[PDB]
Design a protein around this ligand. Structure first.
Ligand SMILES: O=[N+]([O-])c1ccc(O)cc1
Ligand SMILES: O=[N+]([O-])c1ccc(O)cc1
Length: 175
């Protein structure tokens, strides 16, 4: 690796990772699963009603957005969502010990998955959690590749599953 390459891990962190996986959109859009989203992967609602999505948005931002936010607002909301994912893992008796056992880069992949899927969905992956605690990386990654999370929307999950397999940032290079 070049000097520049060895610097690339320092440029990577959970925010930079989720920003690649989720994109940045300033207007309400439907995700790969059809669901109303804004900012950096902020899910607004499962309802098919745009007006519900807008109501959730104004609540989340605190003004009358009419479906549109600023980059600064998207970042503030993203930071709240990242904090909520981290807090969700740490207060959970099933996820905390696995997270604690992980290295820094796999801890980012853990936060990413919980941000995407939520704590209860993630904490139900009994096998994957045991495999990770036992450092069975290849098996963990194959088991995550069976999930509806990955298979319903592969592009958004593929880099996270590679990161659990390798513990490096290689999947985030060369966009
Ligand atoms: O803290 N943030 O809102 C961020 C950080 C990094 C990034 O690439 C986008 C947003
Ligand atoms: O918090 N965790 O330890 C996690 C979270 C997600 C995952 O897929 C595996 C472990």
């Amino acid at each position: 690796p070049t000097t520049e390459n060895l610097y690339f891990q320092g440029s990577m962190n959970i925010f930079e990772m989720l920003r690649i996986d989720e994109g940045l959109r300033l207007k309400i859009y439907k995700d790969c699963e059809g669901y109303y989203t804004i900012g950096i992967g902020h899910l607004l609602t499962k309802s098919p009603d745009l007006n519900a999505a807008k109501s959730e948005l104004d609540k989340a931002i605190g003004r009358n957005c009419n479906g549109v936010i600023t980059k600064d607002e998207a970042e503030k909301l993203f930071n709240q969502d990242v904090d909520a994912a981290v807090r969700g893992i740490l207060r959970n008796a099933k996820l905390k010990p696995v997270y604690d056992s992980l290295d820094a880069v796999r801890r980012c992949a853990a936060i990413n998955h919980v941000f995407q899927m939520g704590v209860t969905g993630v904490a139900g992956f009994t096998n994957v959690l045991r495999m990770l605690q036992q450092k069975r990386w290849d098996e963990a990654a194959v088991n995550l590749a069976k999930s509806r999370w990955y298979n319903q929307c592969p592009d958004r999950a593929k880099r996270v599953i590679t990161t659990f397999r390798t513990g490096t940032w290689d999947a985030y290079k060369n966009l």
